[PDB]
């Protein structure tokens, strides 16, 4: 039974490793999501996961896939440590307050509490990362930043510290949607599998249900995710509000534009969760018995 320090460090390392491994998927998702917002005179058009990744690699370099990676890693540290700490102090509290089972509702409550605090803590990282991922020299929009820390310094000096928390409420709404949809869909699909006994309750049912629940969460949070990416990436004054950005997306690009980057998003989610789970378990066991 690992100590708190082992949990914190293993969560940080596993989350950071999954982040560096699956970061090109996130960059592809951001590129697909900001595509269509502004017309481009270049022939470069992003379509698909491999298509977007290869287009970015061949027109901007391999290093452009990891644009904003230090921001992503800082978030991962904050989110992983905060997840462990608040998981303890909130879920133990929920189970011990009335002495009941770890229901679904308690999992929603703890997940939203932890995710809200994590979103607020890591919003500046996420703003910097989205802006660095979205910026390009090919589509007529001048890049604002040279790198992560340049982006921090410029945004803080020319937009205020509040400017580092732009898009906090879309991020929060998306985190709520992902958490609730994953939990509900996973439980429903598993107990649908079992209420029939369609598949064996070993790992494969869990894998299938987590796959389906992750896709369902990605699809449910995709409109919020596209609007969040476009709003956060936007310079001050372009969008009066977040619903203003959503309404412009709807009127000028329609409903399918709310699902841009859906395949990269789902692949990013699934692969990141798998990598972090395996790495986190291995690190916990190793530091528990090194």
């Amino acid at each position: 039974h690992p100590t708190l320090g082992v949990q914190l460090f293993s969560a940080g390392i596993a989350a950071c490793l999954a982040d560096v491994i699956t970061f090109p998927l996130d960059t592809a998702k951001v590129r697909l999501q900001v595509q269509g917002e502004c017309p481009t005179s270049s022939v470069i058009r992003y379509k698909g996961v491999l298509g977007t990744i290869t287009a970015v690699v061949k027109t901007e370099g391999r290093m452009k896939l990891y644009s904003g990676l230090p921001a992503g890693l800082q978030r991962q540290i904050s989110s992983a440590s905060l997840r462990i700490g608040l998981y303890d102090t909130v879920q133990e509290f929920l189970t011990a307050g009335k002495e009941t089972a770890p229901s679904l509702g308690s999992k929603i409550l703890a997940g939203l509490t932890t995710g809200g605090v994590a979103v607020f803590i890591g919003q500046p990282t996420e703003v910097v990362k989205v802006r660095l991922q979205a910026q390009s020299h090919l589509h007529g929009i001048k890049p604002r930043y040279t790198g992560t820390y340049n982006a921090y310094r410029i945004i803080a000096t020319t937009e205020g510290l509040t400017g580092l928390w732009k898009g906090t409420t879309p991020n929060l709404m998306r985190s709520v949607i992902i958490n609730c949809t994953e939990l509900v869909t996973y439980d429903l699909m598993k107990e649908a599998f079992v209420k029939n006994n369609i598949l064996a309750d070993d790992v494969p049912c869990h894998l299938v249900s987590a796959l389906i629940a992750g896709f369902c969460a990605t699809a449910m949070s995709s409109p919020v995710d596209v609007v969040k990416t476009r709003f956060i990436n936007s310079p001050p004054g372009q969008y009066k509000s977040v619903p203003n950005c959503a309404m412009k997306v709807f009127t000028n690009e329609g409903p399918t534009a709310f699902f841009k980057g859906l395949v990269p998003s789902f692949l990013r989610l699934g692969s990141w969760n798998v990598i972090m789970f395996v790495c986190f378990e291995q690190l916990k066991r190793e530091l528990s018995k090194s």
Partner: nanobody
Amino acid sequence: QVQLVESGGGLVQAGGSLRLSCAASGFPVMYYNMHWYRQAPGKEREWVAAIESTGWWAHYADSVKGRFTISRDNAKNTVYLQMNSLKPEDTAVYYCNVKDFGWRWEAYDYWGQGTQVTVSS
């Protein structure tokens, strides 16, 4: 009931200037990108310019860039095409355009009646 009304076209010498207006009515212009097209007889309708919902970006056809500018006043529901150094090749009917995408498979095009611009030589 979308209505786009173009005005400001006329007959001008080559190298002259002309400011076209599009009065837009029956929709919330603040959410819609606006476009200027042109069609001359014996040619297809050519996209000229596009402006963002609030004027954040503006893009042009290569044949009109630097000569034509596109502008908005969402308060007056008006879109403007300033046309400078006009050449006889710019003689066409100029059309204001709104692509309403909304709850559709592809965008629906709304057009004005067009204003004729003739450049003399």
